[PDB]
Design a protein around this ligand. Structure first.
Ligand code: MET
Ligand SMILES: [Co+2]
Ligand SMILES: [Co+2]
Ligand code: NA
Length: 282
């Protein structure tokens, strides 16, 4: 199974005029980066709605993952699920991104652009879907096996899922945010994997990437303490090979330089008064 190259992009998928766009649609940048880290009760409840719809779309697209399917098709399925539930796909027109979700196979670390790429037996396919509804976002991703995947890749996906859920389980008010990347990097290193450092989790609320950064490796210099009402993602990318990467011509698709495969999972989390709530649970 050879290194991937880009395929043919399908035309822009339409969204009914009635669904409100985020402010950044059409524009070269987004108005984000300085929003409150702790959300109002109103925004938290709206975030449950957005989280559930993103989880739905993710699950629908994941069910279509099979040898012979295109990444564009997965995008079509996510896009239609979002639009059907009155959500805007937050990636669509985000910094010029042309599609409604990211689809990242095998050596693609993240940000793959859905296209005519055909999935084949043994591939691993991350689908990352974000929903915008009620003025708020919900962001979730998972890596799905296609046909008969090699044990080394099954394990990488299962261990990345587990690293994610372990880190989610550390979330509680008064705990240092740095605990998340300590738990993930510890678990990854136990199996000789390497955690991607350049790409991180993020605060999310009325804006997509609100300025809060969540590191997935051990960086105890971060002083942030988790607070009730804080909303962010945990979304580690875990590599079999070295961390070095390249970005394609399209300006989005990130691939490992050594072409070894990588996996990712993501949820959007709320810090509660005593622990955590996974907003993108289905
Ligand atoms: C093309 S933007 C994709 C962003 C991604 N959903 C994230 O979790 O930040
Ligand atoms: Co995402
Ligand atoms: Co995210
Ligand atoms: Na990958």
């Amino acid at each position: 199974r050879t290194a991937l190259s880009p395929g043919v992009l399908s035309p822009t998928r339409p969204v009914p005029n009635w669904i409100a766009r985020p402010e950044y649609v059409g524009k070269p940048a987004a108005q984000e980066g300085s929003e409150p880290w702790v959300q109002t009760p109103e925004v938290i409840e709206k975030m449950r709605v957005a989280g559930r719809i993103a989880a739905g779309a993710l699950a629908e697209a994941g069910k279509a993952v099979a040898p012979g399917v295109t990444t564009d098709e997965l995008d079509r399925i996510a896009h239609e699920y979002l639009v059907d539930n009155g959500a805007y796909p937050s990636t669509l027109g985000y910094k010029g991104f042309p599609k409604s979700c990211t689809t990242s196979l095998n050596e693609v670390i993240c940000h793959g652009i859905p296209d005519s790429t055909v999935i084949t037996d043994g591939d691993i396919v991350n689908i990352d879907v974000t929903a915008y509804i009620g003025g708020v976002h919900g962001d979730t991703n998972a890596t799905f096996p296609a046909g008969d995947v090699a044990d080394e890749h099954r394990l990488l996906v299962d261990r990345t899922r587990e690293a994610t859920m372990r880190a989610i389980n550390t979330v509680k008010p008064g705990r240092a945010l740095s605990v998340i990347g300590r738990v993930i990097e510890s678990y990854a290193n136990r199996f000789g994997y390497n955690v991607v450092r350049d790409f991180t989790g993020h605060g999310i609320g009325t804006t997509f990437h609100n300025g809060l950064v969540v590191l997935h490796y051990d960086q105890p210099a971060v002083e942030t303490i988790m607070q009730p009402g804080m909303t962010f993602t945990i979304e580690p990318m875990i590599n079999l090979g070295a961390l070095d990467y390249e970005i394609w011509d399209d300006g989005w698709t990130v691939v490992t330089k050594d072409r070894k495969w990588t996996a990712q999972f993501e949820h959007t989390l709320l810090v509660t008064d005593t622990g955590v709530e996974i907003l993108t649970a289905l």
